[PDB]
Amino acid sequence: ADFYLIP
Amino acid sequence: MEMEKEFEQIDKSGSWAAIYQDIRHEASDFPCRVAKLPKNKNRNRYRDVSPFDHSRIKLHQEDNDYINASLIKMEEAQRSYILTQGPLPNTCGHFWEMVWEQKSRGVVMLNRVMEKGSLKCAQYWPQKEEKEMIFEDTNLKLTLISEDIKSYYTVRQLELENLTTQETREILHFHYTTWPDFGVPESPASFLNFLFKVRESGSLSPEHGPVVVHSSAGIGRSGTFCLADTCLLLMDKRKDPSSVDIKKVLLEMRKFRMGLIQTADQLRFSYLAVIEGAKFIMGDSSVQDQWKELSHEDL
Ligand SMILES: [Mg+2]
Numbered sequence: 001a002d003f004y005l006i007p
Numbered sequence: 008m009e010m011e012k013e014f015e016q017i018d019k020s021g022s023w024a025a026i027y028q029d030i031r032h033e034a035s036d037f038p039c040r041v042a043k044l045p046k047n048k049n050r051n052r053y054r055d056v057s058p059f060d061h062s063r064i065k066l067h068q069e070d071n072d073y074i075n076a077s078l079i080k081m082e083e084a085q086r087s088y089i090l091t092q093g094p095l096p097n098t099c100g101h102f103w104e105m106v107w108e109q110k111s112r113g114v115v116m117l118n119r120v121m122e123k124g125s126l127k128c129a130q131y132w133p134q135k136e137e138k139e140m141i142f143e144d145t146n147l148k149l150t151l152i153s154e155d156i157k158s159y160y161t162v163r164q165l166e167l168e169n170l171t172t173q174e175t176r177e178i179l180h181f182h183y184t185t186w187p188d189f190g191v192p193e194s195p196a197s198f199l200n201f202l203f204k205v206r207e208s209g210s211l212s213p214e215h216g217p218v219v220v221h222s223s224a225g226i227g228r229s230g231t232f233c234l235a236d237t238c239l240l241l242m243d244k245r246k247d248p249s250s251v252d253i254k255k256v257l258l259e260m261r262k263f264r265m266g267l268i269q270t271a272d273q274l275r276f277s278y279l280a281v282i283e284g285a286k287f288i289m290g291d292s293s294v295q296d297q298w299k300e301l302s303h304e305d306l
Contacts, residue, residue, distance in 0.1 A: 006189065
């Protein structure tokens with residue numbers, strides 16, 4: 001949730 | 008070059024992921040030192056999406072001037088946009104302060120407050136006429152004047168008032184309600200119908216401040232919207248439409264805010280929208296009505 005970018 | 012021919016070559020070969028990663032690899036990298044200061048930790052929705060220092064919007068606040076928002080200034084296209092994240096519970100006052108200070112006339116929201124059971128953005132505008140909102144920290148009042156609900160988007164008329172001076176301004180809110188996160192619009196028609204509604208409202212006029220565009224992070228769906236709009240402007244502006252290099256335009260926009268356009272399909276969709284939109288730009292004015300009917304906004 002704290003990160004938006006998808007690996 | 009030749010945009011349409013390029014699209015077909017990339018699409019036929021299924022090379023969208025390739026060109027997209029090249030764009031990601033070639034994208035500018037500039038410092039975001041202010042966004043990363045501990046004191047601004049709670050002003051950022053995502054730890055991995057931050058505005059570059061050079062293009063960040065500064066609040067005319069003596070306390071802390073930080074907001075996660077970037078000024079995308081397109082020189083040749085002669086249009087500027089402010090791309091920002093969906094306001095957090097503690098930054099809704101900052102958001103409207105920015106709208107006021109930057110003299111924006113329109114706000115384009117591309118996400119939904121609740122997306123698949125998860126909140127992507129705070130309810131930063133009033134849902135009912137009789138229950139206005141007051142942002143005490145920035146001394147602003149916001150009232151819903153009216154709303155025009157369509158099948159996949161809603162346009163709202165809001166009144167923003169600087170309580171300090173009592174001046175008031177009409178703000179137009181264009182909410183695209185059916186664009187999934189990391190997804191694309193239903194069709195180029197639906198997207199273009201929406202974009203032209205924003206354009207016709209006068210919100211993108213140079214006599215107003217930059218339109219404010221956001222999604223949850225202010226980069227994926229937001230980048231797609233701005234890229235298409237800018238490419239269409241360049242197409243109408245210069246001698247040869249085919250000359251518009253979508254990848255070059257996107258890389259230019261990325262000098263102002265990181266990660267604009269988040270998936271290869273969003274990139275592909277951008278090409279589709281620009282190619283279809285170009286029809287109107289070259290002369291076919293009837294196409295605009297076609298998009299509208301094809302969008303089924305009445306439903
Ligand atoms: Mg009512």
